[PDB]
Design a protein around this ligand. Structure first.
Ligand SMILES: *[C@@H]1O[C@H](CO)[C@@H](O)[C@H](O)[C@H]1NC(C)=O
Ligand SMILES: *[C@@H]1O[C@H](CO)[C@@H](O)[C@H](O)[C@H]1NC(C)=O
Lengths: 49, 50, 28
């Protein structure tokens, strides 16, 4: 209650930093990419056979 | 009383690989040309083991 | 009833946003 403004400011800056790290071309969502790749790879094999 | 208890947990196993042509054909040139008729079966099992 | 038993004291009435005026009963 005595530090409310500081806590709100830190919350806002961390929210702002998330949407910059998610813009500067990271590979944090690779776990979601791998699944997609795995599906495609398997299905491509079934065509080539 | 103060007791100390042991719990044992597995984490990993051995990393193994197989040379598909060496297992199936050995050093034969005829067997390799006959195995080429099955498409990509050695690549897929190598990928799974990796 | 708001007494000294179920309440604690911290600071002055100048930094909290939304503080009100009320009495605190003391059992003397
Ligand atoms: C609640 O909102 C009113 C309306 O702006 C404001 O006057 C009041 O100070 C606020 N109370 C707190 C505890 O933020
Ligand atoms: C509480 O009492 C003080 C008297 O010192 C007064 O200055 C203050 O405005 C009062 N609080 C409110 C919310 O009016």
């Amino acid at each position: 209650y005595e530090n409310q403004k500081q806590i709100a400011n830190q919350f806002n800056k961390a929210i702002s930093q998330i949407q910059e790290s998610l813009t500067t071309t990271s590979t944090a969502l690779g776990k979601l990419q791998d699944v997609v790749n795995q599906n495609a790879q398997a299905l491509n094999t079934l065509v080539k056979q | 009383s103060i007791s100390i208890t042991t719990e044992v947990m597995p984490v990993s196993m051995a990393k193994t690989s197989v040379d598909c042509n060496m297992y199936i054909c050995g050093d034969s040139t005829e067997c390799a040309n006959l195995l080429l008729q099955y498409g990509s079966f050695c690549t897929q099992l190598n990928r799974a083991l990796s | 009833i708001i007494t000294t038993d179920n309440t604690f004291v911290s600071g002055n009435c100048d930094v909290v946003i939304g503080i009100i005026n009320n009495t605190v009963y003391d059992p003397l």
